[PDB]
């Protein structure tokens, strides 16, 4: 039966078939990697004043690949809290050798964008199961939360912090926890218990020794943060947002928030996919007085740009533009160099505050509920490239900014 | 417009821009594979009167990749069945040349774990569509289910059984069907009809000759199974369970069950994501009396390890810990050799079986529903490495177990 | 000392599976030649006249994607994927020579997207093709339909427009009157505007890109329909396959007189195979059977589960000729130019009672089938070669 | 096919639940359904 298609061939087929050389689907070739072990090691936190927490990563192994921050809290009220594990964290500044190399500023905002934008259903659902306590559980129940810190080296093992190669200075993470009663809105005044567990990779001796002694230049991502105060009115307002960024970036994100909760829309609830609850009419990204593209609707930026690049689209109020065509792989495929374009400006035109409710008097396409007048800010995030050079047991950034 | 991105460049771009050689994403570097055909040749199955039936794979092609075991049954009750196709199968032992090389023991248990651990929302939902039937259909409706047996060679075509290279003996698997009238709960005194359809790949002479004549060595996975009695009491009891496993493994999974149905939680229902219905409070692995890591909570094993190992977390009751950094791909990236360590132990601490009516009066973090006292056993699965050598028409394992 | 023990726990068993120079912690990089992308808004000719088309203007070196922005309003009708159902036809031709022709466009787009798009891209596809149910009646929103053109599947087979210096690329397509959709919302002329994504390359890539000849191994789409009178009894239809080029999969279904409904259920997204029309099918090559007839549920879920991973809604049936149908690389195909006879035999199910949960046997479907069904469609996705030499592009076969 | 067919069990709602058509069930609840 099937052999008919194997023998019934001609030139049109031979053009697209392969030769008998070793590039076929089968003839499995065994692939090997060096001998290494992974261990998850508890890393005791010396700082608990209810202020900035300094977590020093001990050299308990050769590489550090992932940081898991374990937080224990109780459900303070009937309302289900919205990522309470990440809202408790206000920022995380990673430094190497004393130099700050990665800044996660306004931490719950970057992680919620990160989850909705770059994580798939199986990992989004998991991230919620260990961060977003919304089952109908009793008030006062205690849960352990397991949030990750989205640092530049946690996406691929190949960028793991090469601590064995840093013989003179350590790596530390400065995490500031917001007071439990400030934002979450669902807290029992029970002081959270915070523990940190991170992993270590152990290499076998041939590579371990070579790796520690061989100077290596690591091409890594850095996170840059900007925010400002932003308001809307009953007219279709326009604003020029300055973009104080340096170094090549693959994409740029901005979001309009009611920074009281994780809500970017008029809905007043944790998630929304209806653009009619978001207050951005259109936008364009401009450099040096000249326009790379014409103004496109707010909905375009939420769904079309990230879908073409990587499938996924966030909730409304989150808007993304990509400079390259692939922003999730390790290979750099297109970036805009913010150190060479002197005047980078994001131009945002908003929708008018005219409606009372979306379901009754929402206008055709340029208005929404007046609830938008409670918007407080736009935050902007971008991921840039830099080089982490580890040389003679000390590290730092190759490009100073 | 966009051309500004290419003129405003400098040294910073040297670390992302490639050379003048064809390493760009366009001017596609086309890959080509040889022509092949595939056919699904039905296998005759000998009578299965609640007993073992042998399925023999004949030489009707060069490679076989997957075995589809099709069962036609009818609903005998108003209870919605839970994977009735997998519950009907009780085990499948695969042998090569008469030597058993792969076993799936307590079959519905491993396949439900396998589906939750390995299959994405579309593959997972589809696998349910061909194994469950849950609309409110009348009693007596007949449906055919298409169950793929997760044998070691089904995941990637390149490891397909190299049958053309095994000229002196056959390959068969013994599938046993214990009963329709025990656990599914949908028996209608109806003997289901079982058919098996398997695929074949047919290669052209250049690779077919090379492949049938040359020596081959395939790195394959083996499934090892262990179970013991695991009761839970109203106090925080512990258990110290021996782990009688051999060979390098990538991960191990252990689960607690009410072996009466497919339920791993006190909820009485499948797919519960609320740890309030799961018994394990914390656990650690130990080898030769020395502890691999500090005790981590039960919820850590159900929701955190899975993120690095699978990018997918199972429902509660299924606990996994990995040794490698990737447990679903073909390349081995870290494993622990259970043949060299003489004493492997799993140490489990449970929560107190003191809770009731969980949605209202559940205690905070140290208890679970008292219904846990109806749990009887723990099952442990692990995937180990072995080597399938094929030489002069005979195949088998290098490491006997 | 967990990791230390794991490294001490060594032996021959590990040597077979790991070891050697290859180190995943080598911390290496790959680089690509620089490029930049933007979206150019272009006009569509003939929109209110007859059959519209666009000429792609030279605003860049490569064309990587085209998508169409449609703006329209909600009017209580409750329709599914309006953006797709407003379009009936789309083709792309090089120098007047058609190389990708999409007939029965609205169903092609929905089926190709459901079969190949994953939960994140498929969900977004929904979001940009449909309405939000929470919206007020009369609301207006933007729709962004990505056109399933052969060059948009993968960055790397973008149209080398700079290399086609003598003839241009025209995309002809047709629209349904807005009123056509069974759930149509309004007599509102939609605003319809096209954006084309242009790629800029570096100069040294432009030089070797135009100077050397190009061969792209590309997908072509095709279409065949045969109308039927659907039987009450499980008779067999003989569906000829009058196609030529090599293919990796083909998809067939029993269509109704609406949009997107491929089964008798009357729910829109139907996961319930009870309403499926096909009992079993067998494909024949040169008048001889390739396999034992398999039931409709095999082709509805088991085959795409292996080939793509994604299962369509009930009523869509697929058969694959290769190992990995979603891949950009050819992984097995059947050559329809060399097989003398190609046919697919489709045996329909027997008619039974309404209230679909009631269906009892794999061989049974609803008696509503005779009224709702009008035909059998077939799609076949083929490999061909797009050759570009000295400014002229054409399909080799 | 996901979320468009029906449910298994235990729907928890943090807000309202709105229907057009008819609802087929009955139990204790708010102020009414108890006289």
């Amino acid at each position: 039966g099937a052999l008919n298609q194997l023998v019934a061939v001609g030139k049109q087929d031979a053009f697209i078939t392969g030769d008998n050389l070793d590039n076929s689907v089968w003839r499995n070739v065994t692939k090997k990697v060096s001998n290494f072990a992974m261990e998850s090691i508890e890393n005791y936190i010396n700082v608990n004043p209810g202020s900035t927490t300094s977590i020093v990563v001990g050299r308990f192994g050769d590489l550090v690949r992932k940081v898991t921050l374990e937080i224990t809290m109780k459900k303070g009220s009937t309302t289900n809290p919205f990522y309470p594990s990440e809202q408790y964290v206000k920022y995380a500044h990673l430094s190497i050798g004393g130099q700050i190399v990665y800044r996660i500023d306004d931490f719950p905002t970057w992680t919620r964008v990160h989850e909705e934008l770059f994580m798939d259903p199986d990992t989004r659902a998991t991230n919620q199961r260990v961060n977003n306590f919304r089952p109908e559980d009793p008030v006062g129940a205690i849960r352990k939360f397991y949030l990750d810190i989205p640092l530049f080296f946690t996406d691929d093992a190949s960028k793991a912090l090469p601590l064995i190669a840093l013989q003179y200075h350590e790596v530390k993470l400065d995490v500031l926890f917001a007071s439990p009663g400030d934002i979450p809105g669902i807290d029992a005044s029970y002081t959270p218990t915070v523990e940190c567990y991170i992993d270590y990779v152990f290499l076998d001796t041939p590579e371990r020794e070579w790796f520690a002694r061989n100077t290596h230049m690591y091409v890594i991502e850095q996170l840059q943060h900007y925010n400002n105060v932003f308001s809307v009115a009953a007219v279709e307002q326009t604003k020029r947002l300055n973009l104080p960024f340096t170094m090549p970036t693959r994409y740029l994100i901005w979001l309009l928030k009611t920074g009281a909760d994780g809500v970017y829309t008029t809905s007043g609830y944790p998630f929304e996919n209806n653009d009619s609850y978001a207050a951005i009419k259109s936008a364009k990204l401009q450099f040096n007085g000249t326009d790379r593209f014409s103004e496109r609707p707010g909905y375009y930026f939420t769904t079309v740009q990230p879908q073409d690049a990587f499938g996924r689209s966030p909730s409304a109020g989150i808007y993304v533009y990509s400079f390259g065509l692939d922003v999730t792989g390790m290979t750099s495929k297109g970036a805009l160099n913010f150190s060479r374009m002197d005047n980078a400006t994001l131009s945002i035109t908003t929708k008018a505050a005219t409606a009372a409710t979306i379901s009754d008097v929402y206008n055709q396409s340029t208005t929404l509920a007046s609830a938008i007048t409670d918007f407080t800010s736009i935050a902007i995030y971008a991921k840039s490239f830099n080089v982490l050079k580890i040389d003679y047991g000390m590290g730092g950034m190759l490009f100073a900014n | 417009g966009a051309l500004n991105q290419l003129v405003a460049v400098g040294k910073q771009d040297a670390f992302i821009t490639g050379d003048n050689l064809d390493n760009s994403v366009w001017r596609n570097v086309t890959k080509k594979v040889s022509n092949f055909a595939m056919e699904s040749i039905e296998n005759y199955i000998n009578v299965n009167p609640g007993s073992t039936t042998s399925i023999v794979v004949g030489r009707f092609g060069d490679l076989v990749r997957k075995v589809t075991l099709e069962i036609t049954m009818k609903k005998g009750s108003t209870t919605n069945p839970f994977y009735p196709s997998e519950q009907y199968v009780k085990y499948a032992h695969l042998s090569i040349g008469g030597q058993i090389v792969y076993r799936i023991d307590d079959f519905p248990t491993w396949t439900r774990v396998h589906e939750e651990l390995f299959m994405d929302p579309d593959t997972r939902a589809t696998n349910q569509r061909v194994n469950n039937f849950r609309p409110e259909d009348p009693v007596g409706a007949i449906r055919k289910f298409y169950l793929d047996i997760p044998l070691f060679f089904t995941d990637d075509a390149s490891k397909a059984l190299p049958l053309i290279a095994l000229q002196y003996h056959e390959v068969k698997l013994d599938v046993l069907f214990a009963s329709p009238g025990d656990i599914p709960g949908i028996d209608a005194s109806y003997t289901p009809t079982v058919e098996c359809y398997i695929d074949y790949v047919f290669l052209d002479t250049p690779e077919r000759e090379w492949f049938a004549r040359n020596t081959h060595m395939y790195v394959i996975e083996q499934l090892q199974h262990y179970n013991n009695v695991f009761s839970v009491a109203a106090v925080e009891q512990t258990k110290r369970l021996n782990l009688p496993f051999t060979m390098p493994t990538r991960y191990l999974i252990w689960l607690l069950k009410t072996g009466a149905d497919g339920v791993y939680t006190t909820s009485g229902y499948p797919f519960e994501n609320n740890d309030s219905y799961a018994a394990i409070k914390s656990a650690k692995l130990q080898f030769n009396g020395t502890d691999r890591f500090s005790e981590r909570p039960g919820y850590y094993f159900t929701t955190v390890q899975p993120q690095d190992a699978f990018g997918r977390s199972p429902s509660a009751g299924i606990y996994v810990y990995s040794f490698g950094l990737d447990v679903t791909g073909m390349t081995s990236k870290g494993a622990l050799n259970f043949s060299r360590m003489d004493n492997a132990t799993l140490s489990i601490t449970t929560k107190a079986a003191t809770a009731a009516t969980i949605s209202d009066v559940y205690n905070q973090s140290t208890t679970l529903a008292s219904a846990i006292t109806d749990f009887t056993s723990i099952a442990i699965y692990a995937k180990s490495f072995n080597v399938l050598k094929i030489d002069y028409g005979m195949g088998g394992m290098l490491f006997a177990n | 000392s967990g990791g230390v023990v794991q490294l001490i726990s060594y032996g021959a068993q590990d040597v077979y599976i790991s070891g050697g120079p290859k180190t995943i912690f080598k911390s290496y990089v790959k680089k690509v030649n620089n490029f930049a992308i933007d979206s150019v808004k272009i006009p569509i000719n003939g929109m209110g006249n007859g059959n519209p088309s666009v000429l792609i203007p030279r605003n860049g070196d490569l064309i990587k994607s085209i998508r169409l922005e449609i703006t329209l309003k909600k009017g209580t009708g409750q329709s599914f994927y309006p953006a797709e159902q407003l379009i009936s036809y789309l083709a792309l031709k090089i120098g007047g020579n058609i190389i990708q022709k999409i007939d029965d466009f609205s169903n092609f787009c929905r089926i190709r997207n459901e079969l190949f798009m994953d939960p994140d891209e498929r969900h977004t596809d929904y979001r940009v093709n449909n309405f939000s149910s929470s919206d007020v009646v009369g609301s207006v929103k933007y729709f962004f339909l990505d056109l399933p053109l052969f060059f948009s599947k993968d960055t790397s087979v973008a149209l080398p427009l700079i290399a086609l210096q003598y003839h241009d690329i025209e995309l002809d397509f047709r629209f349904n009157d807005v009123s056509t959709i069974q759930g149509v919302d309004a007599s509102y002329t939609p605003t319809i505007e096209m954006y084309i994504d242009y790629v800029y390359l570096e100069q040294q890539e432009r030089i070797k890109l135009v100077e050397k000849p190009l061969f792209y191994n590309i997908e072509q789409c095709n279409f065949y329909r045969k109308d039927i009178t659907f039987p009450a009894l499980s008779s067999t239809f003989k569906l000829d396959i009058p196609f030529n080029n090599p293919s990796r999969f083909l998809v067939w279904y029993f269509n109704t007189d609406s949009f997107g409904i491929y089964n008798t259920s009357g729910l829109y997204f139907n996961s319930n195979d009870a309403a499926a029309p096909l009992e079993s099918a067998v494909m024949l090559l040169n008048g001889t059977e390739r396999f034992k007839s398999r039931e409709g549920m095999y082709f509805n879920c088991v085959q795409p589960q292996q080939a793509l991973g994604r299962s369509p809604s009930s009523g869509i049936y697929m058969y694959a000729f290769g190992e990995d149908v979603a891949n950009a690389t050819s992984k097995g195909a059947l050559d329809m130019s060399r097989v003398n006879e190609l046919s697919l035999q489709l045996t329909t199910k027997n008619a039974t009672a309404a209230n679909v949960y009631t269906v009892y046997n794999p061989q049974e479907t609803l008696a509503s089938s005779t009224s709702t069904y009008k035909g059998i469609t077939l799609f076949s996705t083929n490999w061909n070669v797009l050759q570009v030499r000295s400014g002229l592009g054409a399909v080799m076969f | 096919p996901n979320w468009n067919p029906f449910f298994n069990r235990s729907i928890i709602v943090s807000g309202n639940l709105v229907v057009a058509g008819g609802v087929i069930e009955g139990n204790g609840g708010g102020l009414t359904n108890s006289a």
């Binding site: - | - | - | 709602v13 058509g21 069930e25 009955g26 359904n33």
Partner: peptide, 30 residues
């Protein structure tokens, strides 16, 4: 996701339901 709980034309549920408020016609038991 589980954040646009809007359905068209069909619904059945096996277990118990929990909610704050409600609406719709009445054919209810007791």
């Amino acid at each position: 996701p589980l954040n646009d709980p809007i359905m068209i034309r069909t619904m059945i549920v096996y277990g118990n339901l929990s909610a704050t408020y409600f609406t719709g016609n009445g054919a209810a038991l007791t």
